[PDB]
């Protein structure tokens, strides 16, 4: 799944025929029909689903909505959280003008700072 998410992010995939197979692969449909003794038919499956959902996040954004393979309590908390069509000079507008008053570094905003740093340029 990871290797071919990597392959899809490189190829065009305009037909999106690979996504129809990736969704079936990540699908939790088979409830261990074959008597495959594993002792963790649910736990290992949930682990595999939440592990696959950790990757293939940026990819599913470059295409149709995600098939929701994880099915967990809460998704990944840390992400881009960057507006679709907005200039990068938003630190002065929202982030820094707030941290100048909100003087505890706003632990949620530090990820925004790192993302802006490695998305723009140190200069």
């Amino acid at each position: 799944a990871v290797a071919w998410l990597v392959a899809h992010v490189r190829m065009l995939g305009l037909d999106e025929r690979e996504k129809s197979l990736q969704m079936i692969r990540q699908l939790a449909g088979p409830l261990y029909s074959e008597n495959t003794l594993q002792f963790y038919n649910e736990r290992v499956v949930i682990m595999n689903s939440i592990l696959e959902h950790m990757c293939a996040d940026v990819l599913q954004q470059t295409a149709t909505q995600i098939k929701f393979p994880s099915t967990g309590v809460d998704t990944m908390p840390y992400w881009n959280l960057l507006p679709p069509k907005r200039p990068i000079k938003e630190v002065l507008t929202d982030i820094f003008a707030k941290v100048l008053e909100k003087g505890w570094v706003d632990s949620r905003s530090i990820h925004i700072l790192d993302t802006l740093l490695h998305m723009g340029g140190v200069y």
């Binding site: 008053e101 909100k102 003087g103 505890w104």
Partner: protein, 357 residues
């Protein structure tokens, strides 16, 4: 009272006539103002009259009042037992009903029929009669209702948020200002008994630095959320929204209660942060109490100067008093302060030398 039993059943007969107009807020405010010190005789019978005064509220059909349904559920059986367990959460929800009248679904189920008589030039009167009658049947109101209401901020609850804390303070100030005298009389005791004397003086702390601690909005971070700053912010909000006539109690309050409860200097700084900004509100029309508050500040200054080792945080105090005399009073407190300033220390004397003009 005893003829009060005459209309206890009369309200059951002509209770339908009140389907036209309804102003029981003033009818109750004019009743619990100064009678509350002896209102127990009326409240032991209000144990029954809660179902009589509720005749005006029951003689309607808007189907927009929501928490009134919970109040009915708790007051239609065991009139002294049901609303008493979830008191904190009940007060939190009751004042949330008003604080959400600015951002949430405000023009929804509450206002209707026909938006020009919907009691929405001001919606605060909705949660006044409830607070009154819900406990008027008991001997509790007067001291415990207002204190428990104030106790929703400093005694934080999972149902109270942390973002619009200033909006919630505004809601508290708007609810409390309209209740009669005994309800909002809590603020004075809540200040004196606890805040100025919790320990705050001997155990002062390495916290010592006053100016960052007293002023609110220091609770921008989760830090600096000291319980004394909460009371200062709440007193600010209350004195602000109530800045019409209930401010006439502050001069007697200061010159009678605050004198033998102050020995150190940051207590004087707390009194300053309490009664500083409202000096202009006083000077607007209440030009009398200005000189009383001024001489009270001078007397507290003398009281701390006579009992202190070193006066370190007094440098801003000097210019504070300077501008307070310069832009508020003028030369009216001069005859009263000439014989008061002289008993100070040589440092404070050299500082305030220019007051003699």
């Amino acid at each position: 009272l005893p003829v009060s039993k005459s209309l206890e059943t009369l309200l059951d007969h002509l209770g339908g006539l009140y389907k036209f107009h309804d102003r029981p807020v003033t009818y109750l405010y004019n009743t619990l103002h100064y009678y509350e010190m002896c209102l127990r005789n009326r409240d032991h019978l209000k144990r029954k009259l809660v179902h009589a005064i509720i005749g005006s509220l029951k003689d309607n059909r808007p189907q927009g009042w929501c928490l009134s349904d919970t109040y009915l559920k708790h007051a239609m059986n065991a009139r002294e037992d049901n609303p008493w367990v979830p008191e904190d959460s009940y007060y939190c929800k009751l004042i949330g009903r008003l604080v959400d009248t600015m951002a949430g679904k405000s023009p929804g189920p509450f206002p209707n029929c026909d938006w020009r008589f919907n009691e929405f030039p001001n919606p605060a009167a909705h949660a006044l009669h409830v607070t009154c009658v819900e406990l008027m049947a008991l001997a509790v109101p007067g001291k415990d209702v207002g204190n428990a209401l104030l106790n929703v901020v400093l005694k934080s609850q999972p149902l109270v948020p942390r973002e619009n804390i200033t909006a919630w303070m505004n809601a508290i100030g708007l609810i409390i200002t309209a209740l009669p005298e005994p309800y909002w009389i809590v603020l004075h005791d809540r200040i004196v008994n606890v805040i100025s004397s919790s320990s705050l003086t001997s155990e002062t702390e390495w916290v010592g630095y006053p100016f960052r601690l007293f002023d609110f909005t220091a609770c921008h971070q989760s830090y600096s959320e000291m319980s004394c700053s909460y009371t200062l912010a709440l007193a600010h909000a209350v004195w602000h929204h109530s800045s019409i006539g209930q401010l006439s109690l502050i001069p007697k309050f200061l010159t009678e209660a605050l004198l033998p409860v102050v020995k150190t200097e940051f207590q004087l700084l707390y009194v300053y942060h309490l009664v500083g900004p409202f000096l202009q509100r006083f000077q607007q029309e209440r030009t009398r109490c200005m000189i009383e508050i001024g001489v009270a500040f001078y007397d507290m200054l003398l009281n701390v100067d006579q009992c202190s080792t070193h006066l370190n945080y007094m440098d801003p105090i000097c210019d504070f008093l300077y501008h307070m005399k310069y832009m508020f009073t003028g030369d009216s407190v001069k005859e009263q302060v000439e014989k008061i300033i002289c008993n100070l220390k040589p440092a404070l004397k050299l500082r305030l030398r220019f007051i003699t003009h």
